[PDB]
Assembly symmetry: C5
Homo-oligomer: 26 residues x 5
């Protein structure tokens, strides 16, 4: 359903922001 | 409906975060 | 109602990420 | 109310991205 | 609850953007 896609995309956004945090720290 | 818009905008946010990750890395 | 604010704020987030992409690319 | 909390956190995300945009301009 | 997961992930996204703001300042 729609809510499952919303949770999935928010989880990808968390993973991408994690990458950005690590790239900035480096 | 609103949920279709929400999913679409979250997907655009994923794409823009991917672009940022790629710009940071390069 | 909440759903209309949610769509509006996601849309501002899209615009703000576009601005970040633009600044990084410069 | 979960929906109201969602509006609030999206609003903080807008604020934080505006802060980032400002820091990136200087 | 799906809404609870959404609130949780949005909170993580806030914390990650706070981390990014702090890294940009120093
Ligand atoms: C509206 C259909 C879905 C398209 C999403 C784009 C939304 C763009 O918003 C335009 C900016 O509107 C300016 C003023 O907005 C008032 C805030 O609306 C909050 C709800 O009461
Ligand atoms: C390089 C600078 C780019 C500036 C991006 C600004 C995006 C808009 O966010 C401003 C938020 O503060 C105002 C609240 O939103 C106003 C509603 O009108 C938005 C027009 O669509
Ligand atoms: C606008 C900044 C003021 C700071 C207070 C928090 C505002 C965040 O949301 C502002 C938009 O209005 C929120 C509406 O959504 C929840 C309120 O519910 C009202 C009755 O259901
Ligand atoms: C920099 C972010 C906050 C700066 C001023 C905050 C002052 C707190 O009061 C805000 C009151 O505003 C009420 C709701 O904001 C506008 C949304 O309502 C318009 C249509 O619903
Ligand atoms: C989701 C916001 C990600 C912001 C990344 C900021 C880019 C940092 O670069 C600093 C100057 O280069």
């Amino acid at each position: 359903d729609s809510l499952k896609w919303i949770v999935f995309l928010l989880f990808l956004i968390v993973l991408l922001l994690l990458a950005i945090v690590f790239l900035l720290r480096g």
